[PDB]
Amino acid sequence: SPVDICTAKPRDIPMNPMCIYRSPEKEATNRRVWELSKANSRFATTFYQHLADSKNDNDNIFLSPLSISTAFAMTKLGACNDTLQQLMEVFKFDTISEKTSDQIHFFFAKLNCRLYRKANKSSKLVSANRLFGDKSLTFNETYQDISELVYGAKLQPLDFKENAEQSRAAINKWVSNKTEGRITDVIPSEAINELTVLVLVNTIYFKGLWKSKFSPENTRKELFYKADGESCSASMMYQEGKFRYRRVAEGTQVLELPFKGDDITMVLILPKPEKSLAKVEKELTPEVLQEWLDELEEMMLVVHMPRFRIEDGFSLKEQLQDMGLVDLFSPEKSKLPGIVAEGRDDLYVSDAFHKAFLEVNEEGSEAAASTAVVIAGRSLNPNRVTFKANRPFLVFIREVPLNTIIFMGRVANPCVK
Ligand SMILES: *[C@@H]1O[C@H](CO)[C@@H](O[C@@H]2O[C@H](CO)[C@@H](O[C@@H]3O[C@H](CO[C@H]4O[C@H](CO)[C@@H](O)[C@H](O)[C@@H]4O[C@@H]4O[C@H](CO)[C@@H](O[C@@H]5O[C@H](CO)[C@H](O)[C@H](O)[C@H]5O)[C@H](O)[C@H]4NC(C)=O)[C@@H](O)[C@H](O[C@H]4O[C@H](CO)[C@@H](O)[C@H](O)[C@@H]4O[C@@H]4O[C@H](CO)[C@@H](O)[C@H](O)[C@@H]4O)[C@@H]3O)[C@H](O)[C@H]2NC(C)=O)[C@H](O)[C@H]1NC(C)=O
Ligand SMILES: *[C@@H]1O[C@H](CO)[C@@H](O[C@@H]2O[C@H](CO)[C@@H](O)[C@H](O)[C@H]2NC(C)=O)[C@H](O)[C@H]1NC(C)=O
Ligand SMILES: *[C@@H]1O[C@H](CO)[C@@H](O)[C@H](O)[C@H]1NC(C)=O
Numbered sequence: 001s002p003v004d005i006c007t008a009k010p011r012d013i014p015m016n017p018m019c020i021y022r023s024p025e026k027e028a029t030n031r032r033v034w035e036l037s038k039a040n041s042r043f044a045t046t047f048y049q050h051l052a053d054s055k056n057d058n059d060n061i062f063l064s065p066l067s068i069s070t071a072f073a074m075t076k077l078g079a080c081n082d083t084l085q086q087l088m089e090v091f092k093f094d095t096i097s098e099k100t101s102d103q104i105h106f107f108f109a110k111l112n113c114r115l116y117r118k119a120n121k122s123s124k125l126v127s128a129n130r131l132f133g134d135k136s137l138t139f140n141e142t143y144q145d146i147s148e149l150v151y152g153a154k155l156q157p158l159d160f161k162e163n164a165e166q167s168r169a170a171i172n173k174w175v176s177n178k179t180e181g182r183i184t185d186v187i188p189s190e191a192i193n194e195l196t197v198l199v200l201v202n203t204i205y206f207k208g209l210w211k212s213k214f215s216p217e218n219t220r221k222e223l224f225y226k227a228d229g230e231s232c233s234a235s236m237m238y239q240e241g242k243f244r245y246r247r248v249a250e251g252t253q254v255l256e257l258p259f260k261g262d263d264i265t266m267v268l269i270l271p272k273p274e275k276s277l278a279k280v281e282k283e284l285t286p287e288v289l290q291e292w293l294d295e296l297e298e299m300m301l302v303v304h305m306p307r308f309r310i311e312d313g314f315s316l317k318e319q320l321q322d323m324g325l326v327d328l329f330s331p332e333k334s335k336l337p338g339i340v341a342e343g344r345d346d347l348y349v350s351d352a353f354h355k356a357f358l359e360v361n362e363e364g365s366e367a368a369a370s371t372a373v374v375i376a377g378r379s380l381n382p383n384r385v386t387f388k389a390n391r392p393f394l395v396f397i398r399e400v401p402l403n404t405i406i407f408m409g410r411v412a413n414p415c416v417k
C-alpha cells in the first residue's frame with residue numbers, strides 16, 4: 001500500500017502544516033496517544049460544565065466531545081499565531097509533552113485508527129470526516145492532502161456562492177448517510193450563506209449490544225413527574241446480574257454496563273435519591289471519574305433503567321469563546337492562512353454546530369453525533385428547545401483500552417414525546 005497512517009511511524013508522513021506552535025516547556029507513540037486521550041477528556045468535562053451551566057438543570061444534555069475535538073483538530077490544520085495557540089490551549093493539546101503543533105494530528109490519526117480501524121464485533125464504532133469548500137475557490141494542496149491523510153477527509157465542492165441552501169441540505173444529507181438517519185439537521189437554517197468559504201464536518205456512529213441484555217417481558221410502564229409540570233409515561237426496563245458497581249461519596253451511585261466485547265462501556269452516575277447533579281457536575285474532572293472507576297467492584301444488583309431516546313442540538317460558539325477560543329470566531333483577528341491558495345487571511349469561523357442522538361433499549365444502545373465548523377457564514381442565535389423534566393442522571397459511553405469519552409451527557413427526561 002501507499003500508506004496506512006495507522007502502521008506508519010512519525011518520521012514517515014511529511015505532516016507539515018502552515019504554522020507550528022511550540023507548547024511552553026512545563027512506546028513513545030503509544031504514551032503520546034494516551035496523553036491525547038487525557039487532553040480530550042479534560043476538554044470533555046470542562047466543556048460539559050460550561051454547557052451544563054448555560055442550560056436548565058432539568059433539561060437533557062447529550063454530545064460527543066470526541067467529535068468536537070476531532071472537528072476542531074481538523075480546523076487547527078490551517079490555523080496560525082494566536083488562533084493556533086488558542087486552539088491548542090482550549091482543547092488541551094498543549095498538555096502533551098511534544099511541543100510541536102503538527103505532531104498532534106499524527107497521534108489523533110493513531111487514536112482514530114485504534115478506535116475505528118478494527119470494526120470489533122457487536123460494537124459498530126465508525127467515523128467519517130469531510131471538508132466542503134466553495135466550488136470556485138482554490139484550496140491549498142498541502143492542507144487538502146493532510147486533511148485527507150490524517151482525518152480521512154476529502155474535499156467535496158459545493159456552490160456556496162449561488163446555492164447556499166442547496167449546499168446546506170447536501171451537507172446535512174451527507175451527515176445523515178454517515179449516521180444511519182440519526183443526525184438529520186446538523187447545520188441549522190441560514191447558517192450557510194453566500195460568503196461561506198468552507199465547512200469542516202465530523203460524524204461518529206455507535207451501535208452496541210448489551211453484554212447482559214434486558215428482556216422486554218420485565219419492562220414496565222410507569223409515571224414520571226416533571227419538575228413542576230404534569231406526568232408522562234416512561235418505559236422502565238429491569239434486570240438482575242453481576243455488574244461493576246460502587247456507591248461513592250454522598251450516596252452517589254456509579255454503575256458500569258458493558259457492551260459485547262467489553263472494550264466499549266456505558267457508565268451511569270446517579271446522585272443520591274433527593275440530591276441534585278449540580279455538585280457532581282461542578283466537581284466533575286477526568287481524575288474524579290478515573291477514581292470512581294478504580295473503586296468499582298463486581299456485584300450482584302438489580303438495575304432499573306428506562307428504554308428511551310434523547311436528541312440534542314446546539315451552537316458551540318458561546319461556550320468555546322468563554323473557554324478561551326476568541327480569535328477563531330473574530331473576523332478581524334482570526335488567523336487561518338493554511339486553507340485557501342495564497343495563504344488567505346480573511347477567514348474566521350462564523351459558527352460551529354453539534355447534534356447528538358442517543359437511544360437505549362433492551363438489546364443495547366445506539367449513539368450518533370456530528371460537529372460542523374462553518375467558515376465565514378452567518379452567526380445566528382442558539383435556538384433553545386428547553387425540555388424540562390426531573391431527577392437527572394449522567395451517561396458516559398467510553399472506550400476502555402483507549403481511555404476515551406466518545407459520548408457524554410445528562411438524561412433528565414425518559415418519556416416518549
Ligand atoms: C449511505 O450511502 C450508501 C450508498 O452510497 C448506502 O450503502 C448501501 O448499503 C447497502 C447495505 O446497507 C449496500 O448493500 C450491500 O452491498 C454490498 C457491496 O457493495 C459493493 O459491491 C462491490 C462488491 O460487493 C463493491 O466493489 C462495490 O463498490 C459496492 O459498494 C461499495 O461498498 C463500500 C463498502 O464495501 C461502500 O461503503 C463504504 O464502506 C467504507 C468501508 O471501508 C466506509 O464505511 C464508507 O464510509 C462507506 O461509504 C461504498 O458505498 C460502495 N462504493 C461504491 C463506489 O459504490 C453487498 O456485498 C451486500 O450484500 C450482502 O448482504 C446481503 C444482506 O444480508 C446478503 O443477503 C448478501 O448475500 C450479501 O452477503 C454476502 O453473501 C455472500 C454470498 O454470495 C457471502 O459469501 C458474503 O460473505 C456475504 O455474506 C449488501 O447488499 C449497498 O451496496 C450500499 N450502496 C452502495 C452504492 O454501495 C448506505 O445505506 C447509506 N446510508 C444511509 C443511512 O442512507
Ligand atoms: C500551502 O501550505 C503549505 C504549507 O502547509 C505551503 O508550503 C510552505 O511554503 C513556505 C514557503 O515560503 C514554507 O513555509 C515551506 O516551504 C512550506 N511548508 C511548510 C511546512 O510550511 C504553501 O506555500 C501553501 N500554498 C499556497 C499556494 O498557499
Ligand atoms: C505569527 O505572526 C507573526 C506576525 O504577526 C508572523 O510574522 C509569523 O510568521 C506568524 N507565525 C509564527 C509561526 O510565528
Ligand SMILES: *[C@@H]1O[C@H](CO)[C@@H](O)[C@H](O)[C@H]1NC(C)=O
Binds near residue numbers: 117120121
Ligand atoms: C473484531 O471481531 C470481528 C470478528 O468477526 C471482526 O469484525 C474483526 O475481525 C475483529 N477485529 C479485529 C481487530 O480483528
